[PDB]
Design an enzyme around this catalytic site. Structure first.
Site, PDB file in Angstrom:
ATOM      1  N   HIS B  54      -3.227   2.412  -7.419  1.00  0.00           N
ATOM      2  CA  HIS B  54      -3.730   3.164  -6.425  1.00  0.00           C
ATOM      3  C   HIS B  54      -3.152   4.517  -6.009  1.00  0.00           C
ATOM      4  O   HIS B  54      -3.705   5.352  -5.737  1.00  0.00           O
ATOM      5  CB  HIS B  54      -4.295   2.523  -5.156  1.00  0.00           C
ATOM      6  CG  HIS B  54      -4.749   1.084  -5.312  1.00  0.00           C
ATOM      7  ND1 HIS B  54      -6.153   1.202  -5.681  1.00  0.00           N
ATOM      8  CD2 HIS B  54      -4.695  -0.052  -4.841  1.00  0.00           C
ATOM      9  CE1 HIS B  54      -6.482   0.052  -5.982  1.00  0.00           C
ATOM     10  NE2 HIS B  54      -5.710  -0.775  -5.387  1.00  0.00           N
ATOM     11  N   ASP B  84      -3.313  -4.778  -9.806  1.00  0.00           N
ATOM     12  CA  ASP B  84      -2.965  -3.398  -9.013  1.00  0.00           C
ATOM     13  C   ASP B  84      -1.872  -2.664  -9.632  1.00  0.00           C
ATOM     14  O   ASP B  84      -1.087  -1.884  -8.945  1.00  0.00           O
ATOM     15  CB  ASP B  84      -2.968  -3.840  -7.596  1.00  0.00           C
ATOM     16  CG  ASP B  84      -3.029  -2.453  -6.869  1.00  0.00           C
ATOM     17  OD1 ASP B  84      -3.456  -1.553  -7.379  1.00  0.00           O
ATOM     18  OD2 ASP B  84      -2.745  -2.320  -5.632  1.00  0.00           O
ATOM     19  N   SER B 154       4.578   1.616  -1.834  1.00  0.00           N
ATOM     20  CA  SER B 154       3.737   0.945  -3.146  1.00  0.00           C
ATOM     21  C   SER B 154       4.343   1.309  -4.743  1.00  0.00           C
ATOM     22  O   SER B 154       4.376   2.726  -4.865  1.00  0.00           O
ATOM     23  CB  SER B 154       2.282   1.389  -3.123  1.00  0.00           C
ATOM     24  OG  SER B 154       1.742   0.811  -1.898  1.00  0.00           O
TER      25      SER B 154
END
Lengths: 213, 205, 214
Positions: B54, B84, B154
């Site tokens: 992302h 992810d 992240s």
């Protein structure tokens, strides 16, 4: 197992050494002859003469500044001076008995990863100790604080912690708690991002405010 | 007199692991500006970097910044939507700091961990917690931690007190119940799984 | 010689000793809309206190239950009976009936909790499954009058969330310090302010409720 003889892991030594010198600071105002608490924060007794470091925002526009010690003593404080550049203010109390002072090791270099305790009065709950680490010791480039010398920490810092102490596991002053990150970008509340003025700078600014103002 | 006393510290883990954790910039045409930002972990001397999918999605340009001041344009090797994870590649010439990996270390609940990343573009930030749980639509396996994780963390590293990689920080729980904010609930992809996903993505398989 | 024995800093010992005795507590009510089926209305945590199957939880977790379910970390699931509750302390006592040995929480009756002690909070926040969080004892009670209205709360910054109520706060040795009960949640979002009933008070209330039910 029999844990009766084992010793619980603890930062109580740091607490006993440092926490007596951290005070509750009350910004009282008139709103009638009766005074009311308008803002509250924390402060750190720096020497036996009664000089106390706090945050400038805590004591701005005060009609009376009250300092409460953990030993139960309560003093009216005098504003010695403040510095808007660093958000520090110096107070003075006139005391008989003798004062608890914050441990300061001028030769200690704070390192990233060092365990730290934040000591202050969040939400007027009473003196509170929280534990984290040093997340950063200043910044080389331009950054969202606009400054280059903040200690960053994840020791939980709340409204009322401002002006209080950040100490290491030895009880030695690392910094003065000042800011907590609040800017939510997309709904999410920032967690464990707090800022303190490094002790070396805090010492220097205090000394200059004592003599000049 | 605490002059010869030694402060409790996880600086050893910081010195060992933090140089390999990078700031990842998703840049987009403005000229060219920063769109999303996250973190990444340099996994080997070949220049392969694990990050979050992302973070790099729909980038015109991916920039990787190291703590030593070096800045590289990264190439997208591949990404996996199931986990992810995304793999990047930078110029390996000139030597790179790499994350410590102990393939035989079993992560335990209660192990002290440090989260390393770039929250809110403040610059590299170290936060401390413990492993809260292991094995956490979705069939994913996560380590849970209370090491404070924020927007920008992240793709970054979760390491133990030895500096060994435990996981890749991916998610922060934010599902309110009766109108309240969750505190200290974060998730990382375990390092064994991340390594496997990286290998497959590199092979393009 | 090629594989050395360096181990990471860890509170896993406390986890191994204490966590098996902390249960997930499910408050279930039957609804008259879907075939009289029992469904979950509230969830929290609980602590197995002795071999007989007596469990401490929070009263507000078990309020108005048609059925109380207790789930252990070893996979055992029991229907619990309400022994009694105390609204003054927000504690409740449950009872389960097990054939095998039950895991129990370590209790050191002579341990004095100190401000700065490392603590672990053990519970089931948001029904994610048992979760361990780490903080310290922030305060061991208050002399003066304060916003909690109480004088004996252990305050902690070990992250506490919805579902942690009734669960255990333990030291690095796995010894019970308190029963997690409250979080300061609304005014600015407060961070790292949580409260537990001290283990001494929780033990005194439990014994009382087992003896009388009141």
């Amino acid at each position: 197992f029999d844990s009766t003889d084992e010793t619980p892991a603890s930062y109580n030594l740091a607490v006993r050494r440092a926490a007596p010198a951290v005070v509750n600071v009350y910004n009282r105002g008139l709103n009638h002859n009766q005074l009311e608490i308008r803002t509250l924060g924390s402060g750190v007794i720096m020497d036996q003469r009664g000089y106390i470091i706090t945050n400038k925002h805590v004591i701005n526009d005060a009609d009376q500044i009250i300092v409460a010690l953990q030993d139960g003593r309560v003093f009216e404080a005098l504003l010695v001076g403040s510095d808007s550049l660093t958000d520090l203010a110096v107070l003075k109390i006139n005391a008989t008995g003798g004062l608890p002072t914050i441990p300061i090791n001028a030769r200690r270099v704070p390192h990233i990863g060092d365990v730290v305790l934040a000591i202050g009065n969040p939400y007027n709950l009473g003196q509170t100790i929280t534990q984290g680490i040093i997340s950063a010791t200043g910044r080389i480039g331009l950054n969202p604080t606009g400054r280059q010398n903040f200690l960053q920490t994840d020791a939980s810092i709340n409204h009322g912690n401002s002006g209080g102490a950040l100490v290491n596991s030895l009880g030695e002053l690392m910094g003065i708690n000042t800011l907590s990150f609040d800017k939510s970008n997309d709904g999410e509340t920032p967690e464990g991002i707090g800022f303190a003025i490094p002790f070396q700078l805090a010492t220097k600014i205090m000394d200059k405010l004592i003599r000049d103002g």
